[PDB]
Amino acid sequence: ASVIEQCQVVPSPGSATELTLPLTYFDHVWLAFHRMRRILFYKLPISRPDFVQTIIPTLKDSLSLTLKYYLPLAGNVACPQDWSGYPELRYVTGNSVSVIFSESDMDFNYLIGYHPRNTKDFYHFVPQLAEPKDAPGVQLAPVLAIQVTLFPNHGISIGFTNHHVAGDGATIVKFVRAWALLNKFGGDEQFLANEFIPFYDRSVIKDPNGVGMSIWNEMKKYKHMMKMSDVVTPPDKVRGTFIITRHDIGKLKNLVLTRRPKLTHVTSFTVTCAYVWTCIIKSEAATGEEIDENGMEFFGCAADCRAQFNPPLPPSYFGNALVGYVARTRQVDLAGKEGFTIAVELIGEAIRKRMKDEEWILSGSWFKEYDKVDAKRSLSVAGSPKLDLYAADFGWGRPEKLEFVSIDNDDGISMSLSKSKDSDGDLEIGLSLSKTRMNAFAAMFTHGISFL
């Protein structure tokens, strides 16, 4: 149910008029990627009246204020039509962010549970995101849209939809964080920490090998691959959160040590993913299935490159700086007894390999050449322990539940990962699966840990 659309939410008075940003080679690939959807739920004893009275005006302000900092987010990513080259992120005085305030009679308490919940109901709280308009010899595409949604008496949700080409994940979260700060302290910029102020000037993304060009004036020939429209198809899968616990991580690390006592790279992340990985693989057998126990199996994830020789890139640099790491193995051994130990070996050495490896980013940019993986047989991680979007206090306190809605659309299994709401060192795992798989998996997760 719709309350008021602010088709416009322009950046605050003091904002610049020109901001156009040509895409780094980091940005290019995301053009062929679907859009990102996150929701934040906030438990509140809020009435409708004062949602309209307060929440709207105050959010409306604090937002525009935010955008004066995170300017491209009102912008539009320009996409070249002929073989002229250079996609830019463009912002011009006039264009703005679409936000919708809606009200909803759905069970809040249900939605914010950790128990598996019908995946299709989360699309109601994430904005749909406008259709492409035209400029000369180019076409523009909205980069961000917000839905704020009241649950009379229980809380507010805040949905976000955005193009990965603009954002980063690291970059988008900084932005929410900052918007929250700005609302929380009623737009006193003296509260906006250095860390939440974006750093724009590119070229600090040095590119000697002309890969920004190369990695593009070649994609430039497959535009049907780069869907410019945001087309959402909610699937019937099921979405549930899993909490692996400070202690339990410890126990896992402990297990590794004992068994394979080499290995420098045994971090929380890598035990966690390694654990999930084996549960996925193991839980599949459980659901009566024809599976090639001999076929290869993949795990992948995106780094964040800002730590990079030269001087490590300013931790506020705006675009994308993701690079993918991939692990691989036959299912046979991943499903057999020393599977978790092997999982940790692989995932770990996937990272320990291409770390301070600047060459492989800039040169041998066949970082863009990890294209012999079976998307269908793989496991992709979304977030990062580092990213604490649970810190996004808007004034109504921290959130009750996070949902990374766009882990759904992936062609073969994707998992969210963030810090717990609650206990310092615990982690949240998000998953989106067929109800029977989900059942299978929830039982494997819960079984292994209980022997730890």
Ligand X SMILES: CC(C)(COP(=O)(O)OP(=O)(O)OC[C@H]1O[C@@H](n2cnc3c(N)ncnc32)[C@H](O)[C@@H]1OP(=O)(O)O)[C@@H](O)C(=O)NCCC(=O)NCCSC(=O)CC(=O)O
Rounded least distance, CB 348 to ligand X, Å: 8
Residue 245 sits in the site that holds ligand X (CB under 6 A):
no
Give φ, ψ of 40 to 5 degrees: -120, 125
Q: Which residues contact 231 (CB under 8 A, 6 or more apart)?
A: none
Touching ligand X, residues 18-57 (CB under 6 A): none
Residue 384 sits in the site that holds ligand X (CB under 6 A):
yes
Does the annotation mark 61 as catalytic? no
Q: 184 labelled as ligand-binding?
A: no
Q: Which residue, 140 or 402, is less far from ligand X as judged by CB?
A: 402
> Which of ligand X, a copy of itself, none does 282 bind, CB closer than 5 to 8 A by kind?
a copy of itself
Q: 450 labelled as ligand-binding?
A: no
At CA 179, angle to CA 380 and CA 153, rounded to 5? 90
Residue type, 299: F
The residue nearest ligand X at its CB is 267
Q: Which residues contact 369 (CB under 8 A, 6 or more apart)?
A: none
Q: Which residue, 120 or 306, is less far from ligand X as judged by CB?
A: 306
d(CA 421, CA 402): 9
Q: Which residue, 306 or 330, is less far from ligand X as judged by CB?
A: 306
Q: 124 labelled as ligand-binding?
A: no
Residue 326 sits in the site that holds ligand X (CB under 6 A):
no
* Cα–Cα nearest to 200, from 298, 324, 68: 68
Residue 414 sits in the site that holds ligand X (CB under 6 A):
no
- Can you tell me which of 255, 303, 326, 391 binds ligand X, judged by CB under 6 A? 303
d(CA 84, CA 22): 13
Q: Cα torsion for 227, 232, 236, 238, to the nearest 10°?
A: 100
Residue type, 68: K
Does the annotation mark 411 as catalytic? no
Rounded least distance, CB 222 to ligand X, Å: 29
Q: 268 labelled as ligand-binding?
A: yes
Half-sphere exposure of 332 (CA within 13 A, CB side): 4
Q: Which residue, 385 or 448, is less far from a copy of itself as judged by CB?
A: 448
CA torsion sign for 60, 65, 67, 70 is: negative
d(CA 27, CA 47): 42
Residues that bind a copy of itself (CB under 8 A): 255, 279, 282-283, 285-289, 336-340, 435-436, 439-440, 442-444, 446-452
Q: Which residues are annotated as a binding site for malonyl-CoA?
A: 253, 265, 267-268
Q: Which residues are the active-site residues? A: 164, 393
